[PDB]
Amino acid sequence: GRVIRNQRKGAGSIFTSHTRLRQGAAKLRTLDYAERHGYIRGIVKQIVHDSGRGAPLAKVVFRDPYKYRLREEIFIANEGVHTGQFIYAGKKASLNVGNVLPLGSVPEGTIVSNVEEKPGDRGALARASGNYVIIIGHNPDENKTRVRLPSGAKKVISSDARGVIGVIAGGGRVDKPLLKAGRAFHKYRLKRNSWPKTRGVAMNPVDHPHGGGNHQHIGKASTISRGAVSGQKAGLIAARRTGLLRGSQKT
RNA sequence: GGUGAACUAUGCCUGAAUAGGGUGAAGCCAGAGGAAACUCUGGUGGAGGCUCGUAGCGGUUCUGACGUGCAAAUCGAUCGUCGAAUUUGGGUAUAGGGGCGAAAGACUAAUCGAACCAUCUAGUAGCUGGUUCCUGCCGAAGUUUCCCUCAGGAUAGCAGAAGCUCGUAUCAGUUUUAUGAGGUAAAGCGAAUGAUUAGAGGUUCCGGGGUCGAAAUGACCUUGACCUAUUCUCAAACUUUAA
RNA sequence: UGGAGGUCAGUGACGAAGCCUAGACCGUAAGGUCGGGUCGAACGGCCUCUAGUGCAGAUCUUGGUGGUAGUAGCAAAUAUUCAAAUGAGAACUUUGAAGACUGAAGUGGGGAAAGGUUCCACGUCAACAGCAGUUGGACGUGGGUUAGUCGAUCCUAAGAGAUGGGGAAGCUCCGUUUCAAAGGCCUGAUUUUAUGCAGGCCACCAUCGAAAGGGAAUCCGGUUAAGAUUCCGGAACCUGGAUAUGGAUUCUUCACGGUAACGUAACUGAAUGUGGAGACGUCGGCGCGAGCCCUGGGAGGAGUUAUCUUUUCUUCUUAACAGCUUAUCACCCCGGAAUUGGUUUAUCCGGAGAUGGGGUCUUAUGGCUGGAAGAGGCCAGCACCUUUGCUGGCUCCGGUGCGCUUGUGACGGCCCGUGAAAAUCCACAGGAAGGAAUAGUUUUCAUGCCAGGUCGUACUGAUAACCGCAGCAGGUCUCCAAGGUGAACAGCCUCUAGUUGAUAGAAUAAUGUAGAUAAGGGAAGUCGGCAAAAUAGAUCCGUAACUUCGGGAUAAGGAUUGGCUCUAAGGGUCGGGUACGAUCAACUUAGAACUGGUACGGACAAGGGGAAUCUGACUGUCUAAUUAAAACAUAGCAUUGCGAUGGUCAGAAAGUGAUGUUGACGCAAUGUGAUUUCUGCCCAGUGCUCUGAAUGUCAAAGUGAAGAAAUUCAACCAAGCGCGGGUAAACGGCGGGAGUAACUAUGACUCUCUUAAGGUAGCCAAAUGCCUCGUCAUCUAAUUAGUGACGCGCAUGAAUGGAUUAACGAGAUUCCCACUGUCCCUAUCUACUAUCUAGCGAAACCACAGCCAAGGGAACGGGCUUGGCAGAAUCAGCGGGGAAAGAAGACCCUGUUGAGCUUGACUCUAGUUUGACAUUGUGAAGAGACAUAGAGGGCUACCUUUAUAGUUUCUUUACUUAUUCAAUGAAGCGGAGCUGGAAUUCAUUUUCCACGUUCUAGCAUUCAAGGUCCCAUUCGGGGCUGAUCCGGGUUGAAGACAUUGUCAGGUGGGGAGUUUGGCUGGGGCGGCACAUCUGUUAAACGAUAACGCAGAUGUCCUAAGGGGGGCUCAUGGAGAACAGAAAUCUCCAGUAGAACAAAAGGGUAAAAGCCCCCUUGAUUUUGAUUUUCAGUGUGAAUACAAACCAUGAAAGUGUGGCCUAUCGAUCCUUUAGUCCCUCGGAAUUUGAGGCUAGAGGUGCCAGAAAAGUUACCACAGGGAUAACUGGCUUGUGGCAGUCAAGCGUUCAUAGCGACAUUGCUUUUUGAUUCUUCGAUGUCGGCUCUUCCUAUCAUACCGAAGCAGAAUUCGGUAAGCGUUGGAUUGUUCACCCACUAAUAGGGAACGUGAGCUGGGUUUAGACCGUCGUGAGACAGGUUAGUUUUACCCUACUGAUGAAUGUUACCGCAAUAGUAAUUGAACUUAGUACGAGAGGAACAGUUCAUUCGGAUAAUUGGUUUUUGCGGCUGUCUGAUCA
């Protein structure tokens, strides 16, 4: 057999992301000195569409505390944020939509987004349109804070990790059917070359583990071990279960 | 170990190209009806991977032409599509068990179910083909045994050549005489084994039946449950005999 | 024969070698010698030496050359002609005259890529331009490409890529700002001075990458053989560069004005910061320009003028740049708006200030002027052979629009799509610095001065400049774009411009290719309506089922359409004493009358339609070059993994990467495949996943006995595996048998075995059903087709998706209407061919060749044999033959030849996972702790234990510096703390904070202002503090874990390599004839074959071996008390009819059988022999020798089994055999290695270690071997005969005919394997000829159970015919019909260079069944390139030399031959018939079918382009 399609993606030749029209890496500002003993005010000058991203981005201008210069930052726009608005970043920032409070400074049940995984990483969690993080609670001894992630996962991290109060804007995007192969075409041409997708069973055995046969059929179980090697990991990888999901999963 | 993305496949970057019709979406205007909810009518508007149809892009049928062609894929008519998942130039990226693939094992320079170039490499071939002067003498084999042996080998045989040891060759694909061995042909089955056609005595040792009703071994026949003399026809795996 | 040593003191320019020579001689021959000719420098004989030494073949190599053959051919792209000139030479060159075409998405005018000189000129024609050539993209010689402004250069884009550094043995790889000590300009200084020496801002990080992206700036006129936005003449602009004049400071230093938007000629402005431009998609309508189009007047020129619009055509132009002026939008000021107003085509805007009234700028765009009329263009006139001008005019006014194109503007629509970057330029904020006696600044005002290098610049850009081997009908990016028709860059015609190229000439036979027409019928043709035809535009009318409500729809269906003369409706522009008109203007509609050979979208252009089924939702995509599809995508649906020290993937590695400028509304991996309605049951199997009592398994390391050590273990032993659970929108799967309802039939019901579950909802002879052409209905005259419906469905079925489904489809299919040459049944026409000619001129192929019949032959001969015969040279055709050509068959088999693909094949492997050790740096805890110790259990060795020196726990931690991770321009860390807050201390500090910023789209920078002590407060300064001190750990996370290195287990078709027997009446399946044994085949020694026949073996036995002894067996006859057919018991008879392990055959009777006693000879040693045989091995073992034994009184017998079968090499391991030998510097004890004899096993049995598939396929071969024909055979098939039991009513034989039996045929199928695998094209049909007869019809006749008619049987007879259709690819079949009949066959199962291609039988795809899978299927289905004749022969026709010429009329050998059948009337309603019924011969009139002619008529055909009509355009109109 030959190298299969999912194997060829790691080379990154034609599968690198199409990044020409993007507005930059959407990041929180650097956790420098002001954000950790006070707050710093900034103004959102524009909210723009980022190609390949469902969520809008916010351009915010902070002042440099150490030099006479206007420092722009690329925040993910939370729902309700408008141009001409002040957003306050730091530990003493007020609990308002658009502010960049540390997780330890917010009460239980706070809806945050673009949350840091580690203090200073400038934001990792709940960044896609319509997503958010909830504050389940705090653990002041060994200063920590447990949060609820958009996938439903529970995660405990340091209370110094910052986030934007509110929910990412652009929510409800996947509620509209694309209705047309052409709409899926335009969606993925600004993202990466992952579309359209030929089924493995419609291939020949040289091209895919699913390929071949006098009928289109997988032939072997499509659930694949975690310890399988590349070229073998096609189908449902390390699947705990399969089939239509009935009932709940205690989520 | 090298060389190719000038074709083509796919991403990206930067540019360019696409008559005229049909249909008539939302939004909007004006009337009409209604208690209200709202409904109706006439316009306006110009939507759509809509539609007829050029350029373009494809390539359905004639299984038309041609089929040592205009052409290693073309020509003509007929066709699909024609504002978009559209067509396309240049730049750029991905390179051979690699790429790329809306997937045909397709495409990757007329090369693809693994490109091309050189070298290893005069690769190996129990297989096919060929194997170059004359005359003289001799002269076969397709058989034995073994072998992943069955289109091949080894071995023995058959053949050639070289000879070596004597002055009548202890021999012979022959006969005779003598003496053995043989189970074939034929023959045989009133001989064994096995088959096999017909008639010739008696006898209730279970059962088929009756003069008379168990009438006692009862004045009858029927497998013979106990009997010898015949008789027709046979044998590769029968035989006394026996060429 | 080449070369070498020796010799002939060989031949030779008075001629060596070579070559030619139906000249000679010699030799059987290979060859040698010589005559003659040609020839010019070397070469022979003999003795020897030596080798790259001898050709007919190798689809041999290289080269050369034939027949074919003056042949095929030189036919696409409408088309040429006349004359002259130039030339030997003109169909093709030039010039003129015509005729035509491209017809502005051109045959026009430019470019990009590419080419490279093809450009241009002059000479010139050997070759090239497939004819020609005087011509040329040819040949030879030259000339030609002129830039500050046009491009490159500059900039960045995807992306390439150094350095720092890190990998890599290394070529090199990563990496691109990363863990790097990566930086200019002003009066600083400004006289050893230009860095001798305190003058700031940083936080820049290479570079390459666009001749279509971004960019500084140029235009017009002229000019050349060729260059020009480059040269020239005018007229501009931009960039760089020093001062300088013109207007402003010394009485306000850095302008005024406008309430304001903002204006003007200027009108300082550093660091630092900020903003704008550069800079952006697409579509639609509207507006406005430019150019083009149209048009009026006038001023010129040309055309037409028998007649006729003041007519037709054409010129009448104005660049860059400068000034003034000119805008939708936007903004400002002023009354402050509901009766809401303004307003676009499009419906937006207004108290956030509308309407209204007043108000700036961007040469957007236009106008005027300069440029600039002097240019250019149009007329008229003079120059009259110095390669040259001069003169006079005109060049002026307008109008029009759904026009075309382009640009612009203001808008509106779309997106889960929102449509580069940088260079570069400016602006703003700011307030560092500087400015008073002729000065200072303004060089963003005007004017002035100088320079602007380098590389490219010709031409083509394509039916001849590029690529396709070429001057190739192919391919190759783009700009401009006239008139008419018309909706239209459709088609058609025309203008400007450009071409007129393409081998040609002759009347154009057959057959063709391309284009057409057709009486009557109308799909009867055919697999199939393939092909063609058929109302096609527009207007009006009218439009069904169904539907996802959007469609379907142009459904269907109908009417009209010309010309002319009229009518009606529809618009734009003004002076207001508080309803009025002349002007002017354009094509859209609608109507009427009239008119005509009822014609009119008149050419052109231009949908056939409908009723249904299968299938895929749709649009889209692919097998370039046989498959466009139902295949793939798709949206939708569902499932899976992953929260970043992550999932998926990459890399040799790396301080390395893609996803990722990412973050679950995400990325990654799969399946299904719109909507609707649904998606049932099964987790047993295979996976996948989740879990941890281990008297379960268990690797390295590590830990545990004793002399000496090398050397076995155990171990909540790591993971894994096992154990347990989950999971089917994972792979997948989803049953039988029997009975039963009061007529039968069926079975609601009922047991019974069984599965993980037994197929649910649905659906169906479906693209899935074998049987099967299912059954019923419908459709038809007739239907293997279609549709509807139906069942015990070979083998339907639910996201391996089920059912449905509007719309859509170059997709399967059926029917109907229309339509037709598809056909009945052909005919006719046109062009180009073919043909003939002049030139030019191939190829395939070719052992030799070319007439048959039979024969025999390798079983289908051109040759050979016997016959028929046979006469030059030939032309056009033609498709019978040459088993024609094209390719070392692609099918099949063989090979110890592959490859692609797959898997629980064998052997591994990247990766991954797990453990140990190592970079792994201190302590604590009941350290499984070493000797003396209770209990719980039907004094007794796992279970909280402690008293007696001493290094270790299950395993958690009081750490950080090693290592790891992440950010930052390493900006603020850890403490002490300075005024105060605090549920507040019981004695001045025992924690922590403001370190004093949250209405607002402002601002924040110049050692900082201030404050306190100091200075010649001389560009104004210094110190401290504002802004606390101390510690220099940049800051966090992480931590002796990870990571990394090594080793060790697991996993690992992701990957690699390899393998995947043999025989065989082809191979496969089957079997084993593969190692053996008995009988037979087997033919009386021995041997002897077949997948011959009948059987057997891989064992069994301490006795079933050995010895000895005793005794007779099977079976019948003869008795008995419950005793019998079978229990015994006793006599008889009994040649073995029993038994002896087994198969069979032999053998055995005081035994070889049966019973008893004793035993292990079934033992040692090693030789000889027999069988298979090579006289090898193996297996059996026959007879001895030397021992030891057993038994028996003894003779003797016994070296396994009464005999013939019952089995195993090398290497390795292991055992036994006196430590026998060796371990080689010498020893001792372990270990190892040797010698002899066994065992462990190879059954494919003289002995490899081994799974599939290929319909994607490959190679070497095979006719040693299958799939056709042919040949042998003829079982089977088919067709006859003999006999005659019987049938035929009482009769074998009219007609039949059993039981038997003899044949024939090769129109069946087997059997075989002879021919062919360096290929003989295969099914069927179509077409066409001939033959056979085993006669269906027609002629004559015989017979009958022939009384007539009709039949039946038979004879001679193949002369003559033997059909049209529905269904099916079909042969076959079947049905509907038709006259006389609808007989059977052959000819390579006749006939594919004759067709066709429906079927079969490549590659695509679907289904069902099967398979884990790749895949398979004599299962169904759909799509799937049909090549070449010009040769020989044959045939059909056509010429023709030659037996004196030439001409005419003849004969007639030989060959061919042709007519056929029916009906009606009459006979005759007769003969016959005691009825029905019902002939025949003679006669007459017609008609099947076939044949030969012919064209009077009728019909068909039309380039008679003959006449007429009609449309569009062009010739000005008319005529034409």
Side-chain angles (χ1 to χ4, degrees), chain A residues 1-248:
Chain A
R2 99 208 309 154
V3 174
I4 77 179
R5 187 194 41 222
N6 66 51
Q7 250 178 316
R8 298 194 278 109
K9 282 182 189 211
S13 62
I14 55 158
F15 304 113
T16 57
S17 59
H18 316 156
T19 54
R20 168 175 62 99
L21 303 164
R22 285 155 146 121
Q23 333 273 333
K27 295 182 175 324
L28 311 175
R29 78 195 308 271
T30 263
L31 211 183
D32 36 5
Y33 170 91
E35 276 235 32
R36 72 161 106 87
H37 325 291
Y39 70 88
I40 181 182
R41 199 191 83 187
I43 179 90
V44 30
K45 336 310 289 283
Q46 62 209 301
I47 295 147
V48 278
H49 162 83
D50 192 39
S51 148
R53 183 189 313 261
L57 302 185
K59 302 275 152 163
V60 190
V61 172
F62 294 86
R63 281 199 320 130
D64 206 33
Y66 317 105
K67 271 190 174 304
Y68 176 69
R69 216 196 189 291
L70 288 183
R71 304 273 186 212
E72 209 181 335
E73 298 283 3
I74 299 73
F75 287 9
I76 282 160
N78 274 9
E79 252 236 61
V81 151
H82 58 275
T83 63
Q85 185 198 337
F86 304 137
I87 70 187
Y88 303 80
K91 66 153 39 180
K92 317 266 194 72
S94 186
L95 186 85
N96 280 91
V97 165
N99 296 357
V100 197
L101 281 61
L103 283 174
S105 264
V106 310
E108 199 266 314
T110 312
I111 301 298
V112 267
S113 90
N114 200 339
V115 191
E116 286 172 322
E117 226 154 5
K118 266 122 176 173
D121 83 22
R122 307 178 74 189
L125 323 162
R127 323 212 324 148
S129 91
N131 281 121
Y132 56 86
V133 155
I134 320 149
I135 313 299
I136 309 176
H138 296 281
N139 285 324
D141 53 310
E142 194 61 59
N143 186 224
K144 238 73 174 204
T145 294
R146 57 193 128 71
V147 298
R148 171 60 31 121
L149 295 197
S151 70
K154 211 214 154 73
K155 147 183 264 173
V156 183
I157 55 137
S158 172
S159 274
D160 281 18
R162 314 163 296 153
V164 194
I165 300 169
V167 67
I168 315 278
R173 177 169 38 86
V174 301
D175 272 293
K176 185 171 167 197
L178 290 164
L179 217 62
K180 275 160 72 206
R183 299 258 179 90
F185 166 91
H186 286 293
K187 158 180 204 42
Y188 290 109
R189 75 157 160 92
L190 290 324
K191 278 159 176 308
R192 65 205 68 89
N193 183 18
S194 68
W195 188 93
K197 297 154 119 81
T198 304
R199 298 164 290 112
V201 290
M203 326 207 159
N204 294 136
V206 65
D207 317 301
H208 205 267
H210 297 8
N214 278 336
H215 310 271
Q216 277 199 13
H217 71 299
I218 301 172
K220 291 273 197 335
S222 71
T223 47
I224 309 301
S225 173
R226 175 72 78 203
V229 305
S230 303
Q232 287 187 319
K233 276 209 222 261
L236 323 176
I237 305 315
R240 282 160 281 256
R241 64 159 313 281
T242 196
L244 187 71
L245 286 152
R246 319 177 182 271
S248 55

